[PDB]
Amino acid sequence: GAPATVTEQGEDITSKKDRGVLKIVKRVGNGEETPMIGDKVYVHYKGKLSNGKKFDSSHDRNEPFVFSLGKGQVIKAWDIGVATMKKGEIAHLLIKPEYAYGSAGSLPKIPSNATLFFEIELLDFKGE
């Protein structure tokens, strides 16, 4: 499945090089600009536990998910991963617990020590 493919082919985009956040570009975006810390970022995404027990999508409200990059308003993996993306890009992320919800988890939605997978489309980003 797509998570296994990221294990097998994904680039490690962590600074520590601990394979905590692995990425595959699934559709190339446009231009050279990737977002900076503080930019307002608009995405669609589909997310699940690596297990496959819970599944979440922005496409539920067919409404983009919006956040300010690099302010830790989302899990660290997203701050790291969305920062690497170009407008119009779609990417897969596979995420070790240290860059998501850790040993504590976020019960009852996210168990302890959970690995997460996401497909993310970067729709737009704009300066604050």
Ligand SMILES: COc1cc([C@@H](C(=O)N2CCCC[C@H]2C(=O)OCc2scnc2Cl)C2CCCCC2)cc(OC)c1OC
């Ligand atoms: C931990 O709580 C939540 C986590 C998520 C999902 C999630 O982990 N995220 C949602 C999209 C941004 C990345 C990441 C996250 O930071 O979510 C919590 C945040 S932080 C700002 N808004 C949200 Cl929602 C889970 C992904 C895997 C399968 C279950 C959901 C959506 C949630 O609700 C839509 C949510 O409740 C707030």
